Nucleic acid binder design. Structure first.
Lengths: 122, 122
RNA sequence: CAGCAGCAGCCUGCUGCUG
RNA sequence: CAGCAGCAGCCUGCUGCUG
């Protein structure tokens, strides 16, 4: 399957996660999780994120309106399907959802959501 | 029950809705729906919204971090409960969710979400 | 707009288990 | 971090019905 994502997954092993836990706290995780769902099919990423401007830039590059539309168009036809973006960081989940006919507006709200969550003050 | 909302519901009757439908389109609804959930209990509003600055100001006043905390604190105790804000406008739904311990950050993201959705270009 | 039903997903909270 | 299970809600899409 063609993913909407432009960067590889970065999930930590169980050992790396434990080590990070011993060293640090829910407000300073290794990163964030995000996902894109098109009908039944869901694509997921855990991406490292350290709250710098460099890191923000890098992770905002993990998908675009174009990469999402290319991935999503595989699943399209005459009938509308449900499409959903989710992101979770520091205890808060944001989900942006609606039909395929609205996908451009779902991307616009998804990217704005992602940016505001990742920049939310301590 | 004490609501998190500071303005009354504005749901249209079935007849008003039909009349509006005959006169206008999903991109020009009478307004938007939003809701706040605390554990099992959900509070809901349909609010008129006409995409002016005056109207934006008015509807952004429908809840505050304080009104949400007063309402939500009724349901609190030692264990965390789930808390959720949702808003739907013009085919797109945004939901912001997490545990009561995070409620201040849920409000901050909820209000930012609401503002961006209600201002999204045609 | 609202309520009801069938189907299909998704997210949140709680509890327990595994790695 | 990941997978599994019990419970409780929520949102999206499709289909049908009512007002």
């Amino acid at each position: 399957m063609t993913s909407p994502f432009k960067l590889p997954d970065e999930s930590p092993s169980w050992t790396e996660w434990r080590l990070h836990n011993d060293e640090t706290n829910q407000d300073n995780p290794l990163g964030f999780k995000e996902s894109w769902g098109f009908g039944k099919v869901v694509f997921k990423r855990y991406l490292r994120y350290d709250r710098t401007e460099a890191s923000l830039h890098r992770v905002l590059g993990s998908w675009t309106g174009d990469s999402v539309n290319y991935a999503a168009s595989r699943f399209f036809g005459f009938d509308q399907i449900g499409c959903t973006y989710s992101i979770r960081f520091r205890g808060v989940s944001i989900t942006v959802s609606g039909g395929s006919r609205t996908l451009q507006h779902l991307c616009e709200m998804a990217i704005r959501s992602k940016q505001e969550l990742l920049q939310l003050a301590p």
